[PDB]
């Protein structure tokens, strides 16, 4: 009908569930409420073997699976969205799809909190000024006014400077790449002259 448009478009049938789960929770302003209930269910599948039996065992009947999930969620203050969600997955036997639904629910929340997780690997630990200087140039790399969070790593094989690891791309603006980008450039040119 008239659902809010998702922050970024995703894969098939397990990200399609989470995109619809996101669009419903944004129409109802429960985007962090059902996100936490998803995380609560991942731990709840970890505590009990009788709850992951309703997601892997092929001999648990459909009637037992849909009655038990509705029974333990008739109460307990869960969302109207996640109560309808879990009885929908328990009818179809797709309760094992929860663990991949929620990681697509994460990156929809990440592209709505306006956020990018990264990893900065440097040579020495940073200043109160080095942290502001590379952050001021790392707004050029994220494709919005996104909030880069941070992450600080240490390696001495870099000769000062930094690299970024954006979990899908990297920027090697260290000096150690700059010296072999120098050397392979100056060796390329003297064999031209």
């Amino acid at each position: 009908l008239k659902l809010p448009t998702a922050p970024l478009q995703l894969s098939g049938t397990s990200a399609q569930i989470a995109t619809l789960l996101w669009q419903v929770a944004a129409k109802e302003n429960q985007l962090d409420k059902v996100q936490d209930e998803l995380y609560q269910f991942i731990e709840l599948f970890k505590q009990h073997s009788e709850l992951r039996r309703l997601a892997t065992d092929p001999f648990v009947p459909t009637l037992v699976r849909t009655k038990i999930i509705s029974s333990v969620l008739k109460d307990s203050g869960a969302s109207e969205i996640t109560k309808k969600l879990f009885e929908a997955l328990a009818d179809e036997g797709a309760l094992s799809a929860l663990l991949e639904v929620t990681v697509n629910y994460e990156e929809l929340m990440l592209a709505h909190k306006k956020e990018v997780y990264c990893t900065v690997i440097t040579a020495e630990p940073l200043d109160k000024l080095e942290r502001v200087e590379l952050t001021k140039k790392a707004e050029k790399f994220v494709d919005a006014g996104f909030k880069l969070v941070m992450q600080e790593k240490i390696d001495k094989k870099l000769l000062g400077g930094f690299v970024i690891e954006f979990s899908d791309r990297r920027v090697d603006m260290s000096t150690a790449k700059k010296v072999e980008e120098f050397n392979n450039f100056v060796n390329k040119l003297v064999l031209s002259i």
Partner: protein, 70 residues
């Protein structure tokens, strides 16, 4: 003039999902073009053949023995 015009370009990554029967399946590489020359970390080149919704089918210009999952 090389150093006054020097920005180290952002390197787009991708994991290998699956390799064998001469074609690697590659997670990621979201802005890769159809028909693009990709470079594996073993040095072996590849061609982005099938852009799919979830992976990129890459035909491997060389031996697929040097490509692993990940």
């Amino acid at each position: 003039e090389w150093e006054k015009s020097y920005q180290p370009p952002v390197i787009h990554l991708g994991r290998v999902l699956s390799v064998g029967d001469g074609i690697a399946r590659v997670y990621g590489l979201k802005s890769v073009q159809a028909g693009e020359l990709v470079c594996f970390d073993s040095g072996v080149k590849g061609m982005a053949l099938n852009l799919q919704a979830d992976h990129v089918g890459v035909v491997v210009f060389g031996n697929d023995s040097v490509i692993h999952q990940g």
